Design a binder for these strands. Structure first.
Ligand SMILES: NC(=O)c1nc(F)cn([C@@H]2O[C@H](COP(=O)(O)OP(=O)(O)OP(=O)(O)O)[C@@H](O)[C@H]2O)c1=O
Ligand SMILES: [Mg+2]
Ligand SMILES: [Zn+2]
Ligand SMILES: [Zn+2]
Lengths: 114, 63, 28, 826
RNA sequence: ACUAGCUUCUUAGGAGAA
RNA sequence: UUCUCCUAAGAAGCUA
C-alpha cells in the first residue's frame, strides 16, 4: 500500500519543516488579540527571524538595503549574506554604482532580525 | 537565408545550454536576448550582426 | 552532444558568410 | 454640444449623450447645493460616460476633464497609447488624481440625501445634476412630502458611478488619518482582520441612501445576487485596508502534542471574512483527509518560511520556503534538421515567399517566471455596476440554461490523465495518480463535505511551459493543488461535461473541428441573423487582468446548477473555496510564495468554462451598454425602444429577477447577436443595421466595456470584423477558414497558419530526440492539422501538406485520404 | 514537467454481423 | 477466424 508510504512521507515533511517555527513570537502575537485568530500574511512578517530581499538592480538596492543594516516591517535587519543568483557569495563592498554591470541582476540578500 | 541563420542560432543555443551556460546567468541572459532578438529579425544585417555575437559567446569557451 | 556540435558546424559552413567565415577561422 | 444624461421618461430611457416650483427653498441648508438664481463645464455624468464609453477620436471629454482638474498636463496626451492600462500603467495615477474629487462628490451626495431625508423630499438623484465639484441642481422632478420621511432614489446614481470608484480610487483617502491626503497612512494594527465595523462605517458614510441592505461579510447574504452585490461593495471597501490583513486567517491548533498552525478562516477582499465551521482545537489521531488538507494549507508553509521582500514584482510577496531563490529558465527547443533539409530541398524558405517560419520555441532567462507572474499588476480591483452586473448575470445564466449540473459522487468522476503534477505541496512524492489511488471514495466524499462547510486555501505552483510561440512572452502555467482540483471536479464535472457534450450552443467547448464540425459551428453561429457580419476579439491578458467580480460572477453562474443538491451555505462555501484557491490564492514561483493579486488561475479545473462565462458576460454587458447608450427617440423600431426602456427599468428601477424581460432580452440577443465562445475566443454574427444604429454590441462597445470593467484597452490588432459570410471568421482558435468545395457542397475548413505547422515540424521540445517512431505519429497529427491548406488558393500555402506527406512517406497514413476523411462529416 | 476539449497511433476487454 | 462499434492502458499533435 503506497497510501501508507505517502502518508508517512507527508507527515515526516509536516513534522520536519515545523521545527524552525516557534521562537516565542507566535505565542506573543496570537494571545494578544481576541479569538486567537491571526492573518497568515503577518505570521512571517512578525516572527520569521531570517529574511531575504531579491533586488533587481542597484538602483533598488540603494533605496532599500542601504548599508549593513536596513529597516523593514517595523524592524531592523543586519545583512548577513548576499548571493548573486548563482550560489556565489558577494561581499558587501562589491556592490556599487560603478561595479553594477559585473554581477547578476537579482541579488538575494539574507538578513537576520536585530 | 533568414531561416538558415534562425535555425543555426536555435541549435547553437541548444548546444550552449548543453555546455552548462545556464550556470552563468550573466551570460545566459545575453545569449537568450540575442536568440529572441534574431528570431524576430526582419533584416539580415542585424540578424548577422547578432549571430556573430552569439558565435563569439560560443567560442569564448573551448567547446 | 557531439552530433549537435557537428550539425552546428555543418550549418555554419553552409551559411558561408564573410563575417562568420572570419570568426570561424579566428576560432580554429 | 452633446452632454451625457441619465434620462428616464415614459418615452426614452438610458445613459447616453443628448444634444440640448419653489422646492429649492427647502434645500439651501445643505452645503451640497448650488446657489440658484456657479457651475462647472462638465458634470459628473459626463465623467462617468467618458470613462465608461471610452474610445479614440471621441475621448475629448475625458481629456478636457483631466486637463482641467490637475490630473495630467496637455503634453501628456501627445504620447501614443496614453490610455492603455497594460502598456503605460502610469495612466492609473492620472486617473487616481480624480479619485479624491470623486470622493468629495460621494460625500456631498450623502449630504444631499440627508437633506432630502430631513426636508422630506422624494426624487431621483440623476448623475447629470451633480457638478464635478459636488453640487446638485435642476430641482424640477422632485415631489414634496412630509418632512422627515421623504427618501431619494440613488440606485441608478451609485450603480452607474460604481466603476469609476475603483478606476480612479475615490476611496484612497481612507488610508489616511482624518481622511486627508496631507496626513500619514493609518497605521492599522497588524492583528486586525475583521474590519466589519470599518466597512459598515464606509458604507454609511458613502452609500447611506443605498436602499438594499449590505452585508460586509458575505456569509450573511440572501442569494447569489446578494453575494454579487455585497462582494461588489467589499471590492471597493477593501482597497482601503492593509493588503497584509487579507488572505487566510490562521491560528495555533493542538495536534497530539506539538502544536501546528492551521488556517481557520479567510478574509477575502470580496467575500468579507469567512470563518471555518468544522474546526477543532484539540485534534488527536487525525485521518488522511485532515492531513492532506493541512499539507495543502499555506498556514503551515508560510508560518515557517523566511520573510521575503521581492522588489522584482509589485505583487505582495509572502515568504520563501527555500533558503535560496530558484531561477528556472526555459530551454530552447531541440532542432530536427532532417525535416528542415527535407523542406529546403523541396523549394521552401525561399526569398520573398508568402510562407515564412515565424513560430519558435523561445528561450527565457532566469527572470522568466517572476517577470511573467508580475503581469498580474494589470489586475486591479474593479467595482462593477452592480445593477448592470446583477442583470447580466441573469442573462448569462440564461445562456447556460440548456445544460445541467450538480454535485456528483466520487465514484462518477471522469478525471483523465492522472500522470500530471498535483500542485506544489504534493509534487514531491508523486503525481495525481497516487493521490487518486490512495484516497478511497469515502475519503474524497468527506473532503468534499469539508470544503462544503469550510475554506481550504491552496498554493497553485507557477511553472514555466515549454510550448512554441510566435511572441517572446513566457506564458507560465499555474498547476493548482490536488485538494482544490479534486473538489472542483466533484462540484463541477456535471455541468462542464454537459457543456463539453452539447452542440449548437453558444459555448462550443467540446465541439470538435474535425468531421465537418467546423461547418456545423459556423452555420450554428449564422442562424438566420439578418444583415449578418462576423466579429471577433481576443481579450488582452485575460488570465491576468480579469477582475475578481467577474470571476465570482462566473463561479456563481457555474454554481447555479445546484438548486437542489446544495444549500445557500454550501454554495457560498464552495464559492469561498473557489475564491481562496483560484482567484486570490497564494502562488509559488520556484520556492518563493507570493500572493496573486486578483488574477484568475489558468490551471483551474474549470478555467475554460469559467472564462467562457466571463466572455459571455462581457458580451451581454457590451450589448446592454450599447442599447442604453443610444438615443431612444432615434430608434426607428418601436419594439426596440420598448426593449431599451424596459431594460433601463429592470436595471435601475427594479430589484427582482424579471424573468419575463430576462428571457425576452436573451431571445433578442440570441436572434440578433449570435455568439460562439471558446473560453477566450468569440465569433459573433450580428445585425448590420442594429450595430450601425447601436442596438447591439460592436467593436467600440467591447473596447469601452473592457476599458471600464475589464481594465484593459482592446487594441484593434486583436479584434476583427468580417463583412461577408463567404469568407468565414478571420480567426478562431488561430484557425482561419474559407469556403471550399468538398463533395459537391461548399463547406468551411479550418486551416492553421502555415508558419505554425512548419515550426511544429522543424523545432521539437525534447520529443523526437529520444526515438524515431514518435516522429511518425507526430507528423501524422501535423498533416491532419495542415490538410485544409491544400484547398487554399495560395500554392505556397498548399504545398505544406504535400511536404508533410512526402516526409511521412519515408517512415522506414501515407495516402492523402487519411487526412481528407477527417473533414467529411461522419 | 497544470486544467479542459478535440483528433491520431499501438496493445487489451466487451458487444453486433459474416 | 474476419469486419464494425464501445470501453481500459500508453504515447503524440492541435486549441483555449
Ligand atoms: N492551463 C494552460 O496551459 C493554458 N494555456 C493557455 F494558452 C491558455 N489558458 C487559458 O486560456 C486563456 C488564453 O486566452 P488567449 O486568447 O490565448 O489570450 P492570453 O491570456 O493567452 O494572452 P495573449 O492574448 O497576450 O496571448 C488564458 O487566460 C487561460 O485561462 C490556459 O489555462
Ligand atoms: Mg479570436
Ligand atoms: Zn448580502
Ligand atoms: Zn451541488
Amino acid at each position: 500500500d503506497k497510501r501508507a508510504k505517502v502518508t508517512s512521507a507527508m507527515q515526516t515533511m509536516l513534522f520536519t519543516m515545523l521545527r524552525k517555527l516557534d521562537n516565542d513570537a507566535l505565542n506573543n502575537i496570537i494571545n494578544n488579540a481576541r479569538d486567537g485568530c491571526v492573518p497568515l500574511n503577518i505570521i512571517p512578517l512578525t516572527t520569521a527571524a531570517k529574511l531575504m530581499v531579491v533586488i533587481p538592480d542597484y538602483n533598488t538596492y540603494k533605496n532599500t538595503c542601504d548599508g549593513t543594516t536596513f529597516t523593514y516591517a517595523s524592524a531592523l535587519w543586519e545583512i548577513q549574506q548576499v548571493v548573486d543568483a548563482d550560489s556565489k557569495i558577494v561581499q558587501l563592498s562589491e556592490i556599487s554604482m560603478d561595479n553594477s554591470p559585473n554581477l547578476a541582476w537579482p541579488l538575494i540578500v539574507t538578513a537576520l532580525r536585530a | 537565408k533568414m531561416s538558415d541563420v534562425k535555425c543555426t542560432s536555435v541549435v547553437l543555443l541548444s548546444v550552449l545550454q548543453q555546455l552548462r551556460v545556464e550556470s552563468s546567468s550573466k551570460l545566459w541572459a545575453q545569449c537568450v536576448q540575442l536568440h529572441n532578438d534574431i528570431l524576430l529579425a526582419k533584416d539580415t544585417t542585424e540578424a548577422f550582426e547578432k549571430m556573430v555575437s552569439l558565435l563569439s559567446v560560443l567560442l569564448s569557451m573551448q567547446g | 552532444t557531439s552530433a549537435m556540435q557537428t550539425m552546428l558546424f555543418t550549418m555554419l559552413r553552409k551559411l558561408d558568410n564573410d563575417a562568420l567565415n572570419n570568426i570561424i577561422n579566428n576560432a580554429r | 454640444v452633446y452632454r451625457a444624461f441619465d434620462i428616464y421618461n415614459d418615452k426614452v430611457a438610458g445613459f447616453a449623450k443628448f444634444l440640448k416650483e419653489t422646492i429649492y427653498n427647502l434645500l439651501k441648508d445643505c452645503p451640497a447645493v448650488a446657489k440658484h438664481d456657479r457651475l462647472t463645464k462638465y458634470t459628473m455624468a459626463d465623467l462617468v460616460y467618458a470613462l465608461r464609453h471610452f474610445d479614440e477620436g471621441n475621448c475629448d471629454t475625458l481629456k478636457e476633464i483631466l486637463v482641467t482638474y490637475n490630473c495630467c498636463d496637455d503634453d501628456y496626451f501627445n504620447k501614443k497609447d496614453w490610455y492603455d492600462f497594460v502598456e503605460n500603467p502610469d495612466i492609473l495615477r492620472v486617473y487616481a488624481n480624480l479619485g479624491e474629487r470623486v470622493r468629495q462628490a460621494l460625500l456631498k451626495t450623502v449630504q444631499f440625501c440627508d437633506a432630502m431625508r430631513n426636508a422630506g423630499i422624494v426624487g431621483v438623484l440623476t448623475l447629470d445634476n451633480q457638478d464635478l465639484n459636488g453640487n446638485w441642481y435642476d430641482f424640477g422632478d422632485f415631489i414634496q412630502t412630509t418632512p422627515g420621511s421623504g427618501v431619494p432614489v440613488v440606485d441608478s446614481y451609485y450603480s452607474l458611478l460604481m466603476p469609476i470608484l475603483t478606476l480612479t480610487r475615490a476611496l484612497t483617502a481612507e488610508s489616511h488619518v482624518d481622511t486627508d491626503l496631507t496626513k500619514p497612512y493609518i497605521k492599522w494594527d497588524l492583528l486586525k482582520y475583521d474590519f466589519t465595523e470599518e466597512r459598515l462605517k464606509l458604507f454609511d458614510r458613502y452609500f447611506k441612501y443605498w436602499d438594499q441592505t449590505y452585508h460586509p461579510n458575505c456569509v450573511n447574504c440572501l442569494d447569489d445576487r446578494c453575494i454579487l452585490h455585497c462582494a461588489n461593495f467589499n471590492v471597493l471597501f477593501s482597497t482601503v485596508f492593509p493588503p497584509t490583513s487579507f488572505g487566510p486567517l490562521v491560528r495555533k491548533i493542538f495536534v497530539d502534542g506539538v502544536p501546528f498552525v492551521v488556517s481557520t478562516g479567510y478574509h477575502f477582499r470580496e467575500l468579507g471574512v469567512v470563518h471555518n465551521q468544522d474546526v477543532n482545537l484539540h485534534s488527536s489521531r487525525l485521518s488522511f483527509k485532515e492531513l492532506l488538507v493541512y499539507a495543502a494549507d499555506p498556514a503551515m508553509h508560510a508560518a515557517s518560511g523566511n520573510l521575503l521582500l521581492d522588489k522584482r514584482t509589485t505583487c505582495f510577496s509572502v515568504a520563501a520556503l527555500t533558503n535560496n531563490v530558484a531561477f528556472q529558465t526555459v530551454k530552447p527547443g531541440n532542432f530536427n534538421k532532417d525535416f528542415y533539409d527535407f523542406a529546403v530541398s523541396k523549394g521552401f524558405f525561399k526569398e520573398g515567399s508568402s510562407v515564412e517560419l515565424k513560430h519558435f520555441f523561445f528561450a527565457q532567462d532566469g527572470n522568466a517566471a517572476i517577470s511573467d507572474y508580475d503581469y498580474y499588476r494589470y489586475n486591479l480591483p474593479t467595482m462593477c455596476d452592480i445593477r448592470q452586473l446583477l442583470f447580466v448575470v441573469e442573462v448569462v445564466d440564461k445562456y447556460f440554461d440548456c445544460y445541467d449540473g450538480g454535485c456528483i459522487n466520487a465514484n462518477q468522476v471522469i478525471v483523465n490523465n492522472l500522470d500530471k503534477s498535483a500542485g506544489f505541496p504534493f509534487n514531491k512524492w508523486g503525481k495525481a495518480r497516487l493521490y487518486y489511488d490512495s484516497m478511497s471514495y469515502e475519503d474524497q466524499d468527506a473532503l468534499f463535505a469539508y470544503t462544503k462547510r469550510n475554506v481550504i486555501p491552496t498554493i497553485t505552483q507557477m511553472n514555466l511551459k515549454y510550448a512554441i510561440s510566435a511572441k517572446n512572452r513566457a506564458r507560465t502555467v499555474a498547476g493548482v493543488s490536488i485538494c482544490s482540483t479534486m473538489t472542483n471536479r466533484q462540484f463541477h464535472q456535471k455541468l462542464l461535461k454537459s457543456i463539453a457534450a452539447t452542440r449548437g450552443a453558444t459555448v462550443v467547448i467540446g465541439t470538435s473541428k474535425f468531421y465537418g464540425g467546423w461547418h456545423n459551428m459556423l452555420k450554428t453561429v449564422y442562424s438566420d441573423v439578418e444583415n449578418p457580419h462576423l466579429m471577433g476579439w481576443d481579450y488582452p491578458k485575460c488570465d491576468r487582468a480579469m477582475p475578481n467580480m467577474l470571476r465570482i460572477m462566473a463561479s456563481l453562474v457555474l454554481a447555479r446548477k445546484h438548486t437542489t443538491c446544495c444549500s445557500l451555505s454550501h454554495r457560498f462555501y464552495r464559492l469561498a473555496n473557489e475564491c481562496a484557491q483560484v482567484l486570490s490564492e497564494m502562488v509559488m514561483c520556484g520556492g518563493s510564495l507570493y500572493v496573486k493579486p486578483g488574477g484568475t488561475s489558468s490551471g483551474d479545473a474549470t478555467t475554460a468554462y469559467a472564462n467562457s462565462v466571463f466572455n459571455i458576460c462581457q458580451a451581454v454587458t457590451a450589448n446592454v451598454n450599447a442599447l442604453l447608450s443610444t438615443d431612444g427617440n432615434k430608434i426607428a423600431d418601436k419594439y426596440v425602444r420598448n426593449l431599451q426602456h424596459r431594460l433601463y427599468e429592470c436595471l435601475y428601477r427594479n430589484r427582482d429577477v424579471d424573468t419575463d424581460f430576462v428571457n425576452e432580452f436573451y431571445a433578442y440577443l440570441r436572434k440578433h447577436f449570435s455568439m460562439m465562445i471558446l473560453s477566450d475566443d468569440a465569433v459573433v454574427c450580428f445585425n448590420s443595421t442594429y450595430a450601425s444604429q447601436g442596438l447591439v454590441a460592436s467593436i467600440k462597445n467591447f473596447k469601452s466595456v473592457l476599458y471600464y470593467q475589464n481594465n484593459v484597452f482592446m487594441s484593434e490588432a486583436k479584434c476583427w470584423t468580417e463583412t461577408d459570410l463567404t469568407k468565414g471568421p478571420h480567426e478562431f482558435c488561430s484557425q482561419h477558414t474559407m469556403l471550399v468545395k468538398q463533395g459537391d457542397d461548399y463547406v468551411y475548413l479550418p486551416y492553421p497558419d502555415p508558419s505554425r505547422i512548419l515550426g511544429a515540424g522543424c523545432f521539437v521540445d525534447d520529443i523526437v530526440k529520444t526515438d524515431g517512431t514518435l516522429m511518425i505519429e507526430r507528423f501524422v497529427s501535423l498533416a491532419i492539422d495542415a490538410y485544409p491548406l491544400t484547398k487554399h488558393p495560395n500554392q505556397e500555402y498548399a504545398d505544406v501538406f504535400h511536404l508533410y506527406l512526402q516526409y511521412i512517406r519515408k517512415l522506414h497514413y501515407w495516402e492523402p485520404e487519411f487526412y481528407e476523411a477527417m473533414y467529411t462529416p461522419h
